[PDB]
Structures are given as C-alpha cells and as structure tokens.
Amino acid sequence: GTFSLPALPYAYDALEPSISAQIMELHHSKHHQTYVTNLNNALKTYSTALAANDVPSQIALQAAIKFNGGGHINHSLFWENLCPASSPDADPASAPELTAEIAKTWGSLDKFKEAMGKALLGIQGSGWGWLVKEGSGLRIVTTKDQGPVVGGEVPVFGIDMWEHAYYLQYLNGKAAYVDNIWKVINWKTAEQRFKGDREDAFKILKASL
Template identity: 55%
Template sequence: MFRPTRVIMSAVLPQLKYGYEQLEPAISRQIMELHHSKHHATYVANYNKAFEDIQAAASSSDIKKQIALQAAIKFNGGGHINHSLFWENLAPTANGGGEFPSSGPLADQVKADFGGLDGLKKAVNAAALGIQGSGWAWLGYNPTTKKLEAVSTANQDPLLGYVPLVGIDMWEHAFYLDYKNVKQSYLDAIWTVINWKEAEARLAKA
C-alpha cells in the first residue's frame, strides 16, 4: 500500500524580497499582486488540500483515491515550485535586475554555450514562443553534459533533470494584463528584471 513520506511538509507562500510595484514598467503592480497573492496562493492551498486528502486516503487504505490525487499533487506542487523559483529570478533594476555579469563563471558558461547573452536570450525566447498553450521557458544547467540549455515544460511541470537557473512563466496570467497576446513584448521586458546574481549562485551550487 502506498503511503506518502513523512518528510513532505505543507507548502507555504513565500514572501517577496521586493514590493509588487518595484518591477515596473517590466511587470505591473497589478499583475504582480494578482500573480503572487492569488495565483500562487491558490497553488499552495490546493497542494496542501490534496496532500491532506492523500494522507487520509492512505490511512484508510483507499488506493484508488490516492492514485486519483496524484494529478493534483503534481499540478499544484509544480505550480508552487515553479513560482517560488520565478520570484527569486526577478529583481528591481535599482537592485541590479537585468545586469548580466561581464565576467565570471556564468558569463564564461553563457559565452561557451550560446556565444553570449544575445544568443542565450534568442534560445530561451524561442523555447518560450514554441510552447503550445501554457508552460514555462527555462535556462537550465544539464549536469550530464555540463552545459546550459534552453528548454520548456508544459503547464506547471517542474524542470526535471536540470538545475533551473532562470524560469519564465508563459501562462497568460503572467503577462496578459500588460502585453495582451504579444508574448515577444513580454519576453523583451522580462529580461530587464532578471536576477542574474541568483542565476549565478544556482550555477555555482550545480
């Protein structure tokens, strides 16, 4: 009988390290507030509810219900993981957002794998614009090849098999109020608030 591991803890909505308005004009306060306090909070609440339900199903030996709850665990848990990374990916321009390092491990790796920052943006943008429906575009470090790659995941699937350095939310709730259906304009703007210091720290840990 399947029993969920006891080390799984309830998800908690993270506090942002900046104000909702501090990413403007790239991302409006309205989008940030709705995205964090409503969308992400809903993933957290739904994950916690699904986890409680799966514990109850395990206690009652209801295997069928445990199986049925796996989709909710995956979707909402993935939504929580992805968004928690996303908030850390961003920084106000006043705090260095958008400032790509001129030298160091990240700059060297980007030059080796993409030819430079412009090549990186082109590759990640292509992964983002290639998503059919909703999903995420990623700059990930492949520990097998020891290279950076631009990849995408569908819906709220987390990036597995890679170390995520930068993730870009390509769900409409992340950009539609500001950019309508012009995804390229959203992508152009979000690069101006990417937290490259965080990306470099993740690369160092990888």
Template identity: 50%
Template sequence: MVCVILQCVATLNPFLGILASRQKHALPDLPYDYGALEPHISAEIMQLHHSKHHAAYVNNLNITEEKYQEALAKGDVTGQVALQAALRFNGGGHINHTIFWTNLSPNGGGEPQECLLKPWCDLMEAIKRDFGSFQKLKEKMSAATVAVQGSGWGWLGFDKENGRLRIAACANQDPLQGTTGLIPLLGIDVWEHAYYLQYKNVRPDYVKAIWNIVNWENVSERFKAASK
C-alpha cells in the same frame, strides 16, 4: 467492541501523527514590493499573480497532500494514483513560482558580470561555452519560451550529468527538474495571468521585457549550487 475501537485508534495513531507533524506549505513573501518591477511588470499583475494565483497553488497543494496522506494510510492505491495530477499541477505551481520571484529583481537586467565576481564569472563562462554568447542565450531562450503552446514555462536549466546549461520548455505547471531532470536556474512564466493585463496577447514583448529585471545574482547562485 471496545477492543475493535482501540485497535482502530492504534492503527490510526501513526497517520494522525503524520498529519499533525506535517508542516504545511506557505506562500513565500516577495523580496520586493508589488510595484517594484514596473514598468516591466505592473503592480496589478504582481499582486494578482502572487496573492491570488500562487496562493491558490499553495492552498490546493496542502489540501491535496492531506488527501494523499489519507489514501496512503488506508492503503488506497487507486486514490493515490488519482491525486498525482493535482500534486504535479499544484506542487509544480508552487515550486515554479517560488523560483520565479527570486529570479526577478528591480535591480536586475544586464548580463552576468564577466570574470569580475564569482559565481557570476562561472555562469558567464558556461553561457559562452554552451551557447556561444550571452546574446545567443537570450535569443534561444526567448524563442523557446514564446513558442510554448498554451500555458507553460521557459527555462534555463543545468544538466548535472554532463555539466552543461540547457534550455527547455515545460507545459502547464510541470516542474523542470521533475519533468526533465534539469536543475532550474532561470524560469519565465508564460501563463497569460503573468502578462495579459499589461501585454495583452503580445507574448514576445513580455518575454523581451523580462530580461530587464532578471536577477543574475540569484541565477548565478543557483548555478553555483547546482554545479557542486
């Protein structure tokens, strides 16, 4: 009996080590105050969105990963498969929102500077090449984002294979790169919790307002990193 127990402990030791050493995901701090994006996004929305909704994705992702590690250690393939949806939803929610917060800035808006300061210059050149103009990018991305059925995200992404910018929409919390292969540069959250308290059911007004606070410096840095 003692031998059996010792064998079990020996078998579990690697798994216990994984759980002990695995660093849990944490809710990132915002790079600005909750009220900093007003009047475009209210402080109430930002506080609820960040401290409640994003926090829930982080918490549920940690719980799901622990369950997945347990299923993995047991060789429980059925359990691993059953957890995929929760990993995708909560993992995607964490990834998407972490990008979203940095895509916004109280000093944002306007458009990428045209050939005055790299990598802004590079991004503006790519926008003109792939969409014709900055205004056409805004129009196409806004239309695709507003048209998302139910909840989801509108994205500007980078296609590594052909070196082009592309617009895409993802349902629910599906992460852009894991779903389409595109590297995310700029995301617009169109879950109702992102805008309903302020814009009610008028999603187009919310999407229009977002352009006033886009952090083009952040988007440009993401483009520079993706282009390497």
C-alpha cells in the same frame, strides 16, 4: 501539508515597467497562493486515501500534488530570479561564471537570449521556459503547465509563459513581454544557482511527486 506562500523579495510594483503591479499582486496573492492552498489540501487528503486503501483517490490526489506542487516550486523559483531593473543584480555582470558558460554554449548572451525567446514563444498552451544546468552542459528546456524541472536538470532561472503572467499588460503580445522581462532577471540568483551556492529548498516536496 504545511507549505506556505513565500514573501516576495520586493513590493508588487517593484518590477515596473517590465511587469505591472496588478499582475504581480494577482500572480502572487491569487495564482501562487491557490497552488499552495491546494497543494496542502491534496497532501492531507492523500494521507487519508492511503490509510483507507482508496486507490482511485490516491491516483487523483497524486495528480493534484504534482500540479500544485509544481506550481509552488515554479513560482517560488520565479520570484527569486526576478529583481527591480535598477538593482545591480539585474546586471549580467553579476553572473560572471554563468555568462562565461552561456557564451561558450550559444556564442554570446544576446544569442542565448534570442534562442530562449524563441523557445518561450513556441510553447503550445500554458508552460514555462528554463535555463537548466546538466552535467553535460547548459540547456534551454520548456515544461508544460506547472511541470517543474527535476532530476539531473538544475534550474538556473525560469520565465512563466502562462497567459496570466503577462496578458493584462501585454495582451496577446507575448513577444513584448519576453523582451521586457530580461530587464528584471536577477542574474545574481542565476549565478548562485549555477554555482550550486543555494540549497534546494524543495528536496522533500520533490519526493512527493
């Protein structure tokens, strides 16, 4: 249980005006931090419950590990696939192979953005939207709460649709949040994940879910 909060690749105000400095600070230093802290605590306590043959605690702590582990994975991925709007990495030309495949699948990048926006706005309750790479092709999938993408689904990029991700700035207007987050998507990161050029940093953690 020695997981740590990652440093952001940028300052808390670096994604303005798409995402406010207050949201970024809270989202990282409070929400993500709490997932890390509670993940570590559940993992250590789980080791005690296993040795004690305490089946009720094992079941409860496994659920806590899945929730907080998913929160750690998802937010870690999220920071990496965001960048300042002025960065060259926010230009989809940074992702030639990914955008070529997107066009073959949805017709165009704009048509893909429309489809993913509808999926994001359709999530009931808290959750995430993902572009994932499967052997059978690219696909848009959503997960509830802190469910991570696992198995044969390789995450290309994710967008957080929990209300804490946008409410202070956009209020109930989650559509405006989604419209603006496209400006700060790190297409360089998405390309690297699509091509398989980044090792999976959470391979071990996924084994504990």
